[PDB]
Amino acid sequence: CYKQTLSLTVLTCIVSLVGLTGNAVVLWLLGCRMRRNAFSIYILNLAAADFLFLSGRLIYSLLSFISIPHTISKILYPVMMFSYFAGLSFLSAVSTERCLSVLWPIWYRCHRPTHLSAVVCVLLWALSLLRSILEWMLCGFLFSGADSAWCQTSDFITVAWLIFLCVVLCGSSLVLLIRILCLTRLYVTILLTVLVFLLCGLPFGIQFFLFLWIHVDREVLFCHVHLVSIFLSALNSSANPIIYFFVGSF
Amino acid sequence: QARKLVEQLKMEANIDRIKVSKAAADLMAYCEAHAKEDPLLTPVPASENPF
Amino acid sequence: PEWWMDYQKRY
Amino acid sequence: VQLVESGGGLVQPGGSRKLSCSASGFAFSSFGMHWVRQAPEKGLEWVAYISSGSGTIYYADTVKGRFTISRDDPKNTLFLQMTSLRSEDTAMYYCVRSIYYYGSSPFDFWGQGTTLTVSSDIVMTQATSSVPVTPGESVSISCRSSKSLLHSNGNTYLYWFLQRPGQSPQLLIYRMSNLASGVPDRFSGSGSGTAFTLTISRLEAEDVGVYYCMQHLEYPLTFGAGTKLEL
Amino acid sequence: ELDQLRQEAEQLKNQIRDARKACADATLSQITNNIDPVGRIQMRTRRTLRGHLAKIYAMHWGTDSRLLVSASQDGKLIIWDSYTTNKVHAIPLRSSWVMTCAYAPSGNYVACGGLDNICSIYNLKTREGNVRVSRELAGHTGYLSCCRFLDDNQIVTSSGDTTCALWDIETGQQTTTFTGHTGDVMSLSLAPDTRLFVSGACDASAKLWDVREGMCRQTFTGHESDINAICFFPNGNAFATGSDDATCRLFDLRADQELMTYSHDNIICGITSVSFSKSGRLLLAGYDDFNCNVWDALKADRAGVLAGHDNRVSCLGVTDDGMAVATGSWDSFLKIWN
Amino acid sequence: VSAEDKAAAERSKMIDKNLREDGEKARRTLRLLLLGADNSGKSTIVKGIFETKFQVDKVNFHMFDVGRRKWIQCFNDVTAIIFVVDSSDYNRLQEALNDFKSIWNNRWLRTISVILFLNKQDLLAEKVLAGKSKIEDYFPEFARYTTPEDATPEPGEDPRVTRAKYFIRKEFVDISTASGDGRHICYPHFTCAVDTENARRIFNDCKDIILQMNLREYNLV
Fold it and tell me: Membrane-spanning residues where (chain B)?
């Protein structure tokens, strides 16, 4: 299995590098701008969530080759997954307000509070933290000797949290298509953002927390599901500054 | 009617022009006499900028 | 718990 | 522009009262209002301050914890509620409007006050206490301070006030150099940090009274002992 | 007939043109060729003034070089303390369509006007604490483009009815009407001695007026599009103009023709505002291309750029002490450069 | 900060608290600009500045008419320009089509949409049924023009009027489709003098203008 592990891990770093710099430019461009519309605050927060995730993924992948302390991973994992989940919620938030722009356009442009995007983004940051602290408590050192049924619920909530973010993303994107139908870019962009989420961003996390409590073959699950999901996640986060910012910038 | 335009052009037709060579020197002298008093040209130290 | 591989031991 | 006050009268010690002042003639909401009291024979002492929007309230340590200041913007009225009155709280309470921006003149208007008869700090001193002067002659009133009143922004925060007999104090010089509106040009101000003077060239009648110098550098606002000019 | 009178105009228009070529013995470029270039001017944004919720069309400085007034389509004049970025006043306006703003030399008054054809004068410092209208000046049949003060009771206005006006605010009526433009007047500048003023109009012409008399002493015609901005040289013997043809031009009063042109093939956008520095060595012009340029007024070479705005740069001013430059834009922001 | 500079800062904060509050009222009102030559019935549709306020479906509208190549830059941030054209006076339709071209192709109105009310479709019916006046004398292309069979929303009116109608609408829409790049749209209507449905049409058109602004915020269109 030495071919597969080295092939994908090297590629993930290159995907990380092409995207980690692709999100710094977004953070630089959107940070300097002063207009800062509703869409831009979400993209700014989504670019921030990708920076920590790719930094964690790049650092983690390098240590698979080079040597370093093993305790470093203790401070590297619960930063990636705090940033992986924040980015996935910011995408469900973009499509929700994208739908509200079409259903109620006058309300969006005239009656929507100006700091709704700021408040919703800090709430989603708080929710991701609350999930992470709950996991570190019920699954780890503070319930180590109690029982193994306290980590199981912390993984059941996480899977139930990821499904909700798919329903909010896909439900919002489906309702928009109905309102417009009842236009080439509108279909292409909507179906592109859903597919890059369903099969590039969501697979990891769903398999990590499902298979963490369902037994499967080690060879299939590791070299073909866990490593492929790692590579796909960095592909989604790298693709987000393109799909959301630079498509409209040129 | 058209008597105003011909009367106005007469006023501008007879005025004391001076040479452009004398014009540039007078402008140049003002920009050399006061060249030490414009902060925008030569930046003033940070202890003299109110900004 | 028994079937968990290395990375499933995150903490 | 008017500031008429109500309340007052004899109060027993340990009691309570609510002094009130009403404004009519100016934008009361865009003004900060001060309370300054004056004992029967002593000088002027600063009590409390409420800002525009009521978002900033300061008190003197004598009245802190037992006096509350408030304003009613729709009704154009300023309050001051007493608790646990004392024998040191006997004075005539004045209401002062103050407006703060660049180039403004704070402590412009003083309303004739109400009499209540209950039955660190920048000390700054007026060395003289009484000046017998001849009409038409220039007179100089000087007061000094403990620390420099010249700020890093170039403003020397010292105010000169005049109290004619049986009248409310009015402003003459704000920030050590600037004449107030309606004040004759014969008045002038000069000085450095911890050294100030007020020159009244070509003195005239209806210009005799007790001259006060106030600091606005920091709270509490400290007045002077008061130098009076008599004929 | 009318042809005979119209034929005399063509005789003089060539007589002035001929008598004007007898004075061009050398150009301003040849004479100022052997003077050292200014260099590269590196100005950084020292302040940004926030609070306007719409486009800014005009600003004007105060003689104290610290306060400035700003106008915006939101319908509010704000007076700023540039050193501390504070807001001294916010003055609501009857009409939201404001094109001009003036700050009186004494500081007691600010003027405003626009599509309402009215120049409204405001009493800044008065009792009652608040800013109120002292006079609404009416009489123009077109929108108001620029207004400048000569005194607390003496004001010059330019309108889109091809006329400029001189007013007495105490009386409230026009004293002098300056006529002679065949198009809308977009800007005017006041001589430092307050005895002359130049007017730029949408007929590609610039006219020098005598305030005391009421006559057009000279007419300058060198542009090819609308003149949008105008500014005297500090000496009072020259002025610079800005046009929709992406050129700035310098005109001499005494010689009575153009001395220099400030063009560059990269610039194809019009010039909104123009201003000089305290000495006259720098010409600052604002452009529709979101940024401002700094020219060397004696060598015609670009000396820098002030690129900090996200929309059209609408206004531009230099303090009387030359410590700062303030720009405003349609992106609802002001910036103090140094 | 001194005591006075601190008090000045607190005043500056309260000016902000009122600037933003006024901005909220400004954000919920929709500004329009009314244009049209004299004889257009411009002032009689919603039944130097004359502001007019009407509200429909609890949405505030605000209409200005000026009584132009220079001041038109002020109205770079309006919701719509309402252009009002008499479809009866065949002499001056060329002026109307040239007036409309200059507004459509103006540098500062590149992203401003135009609602196009064609006044006096009742007077047009009289001139086209009476027979005294003919379009072909004024626009030669009318003779070689056939009514679109597909676009036939004509309820209970002569095909001669509908031929005359839809030809005048084409002459304006084609100016809109020529150089628009898709950033701004023209909405053509047909209003008489007794028409009362006018306020709704401006509203139903502004709801589409705002929808296309939001579809450009999210890079969808």
Answer: none
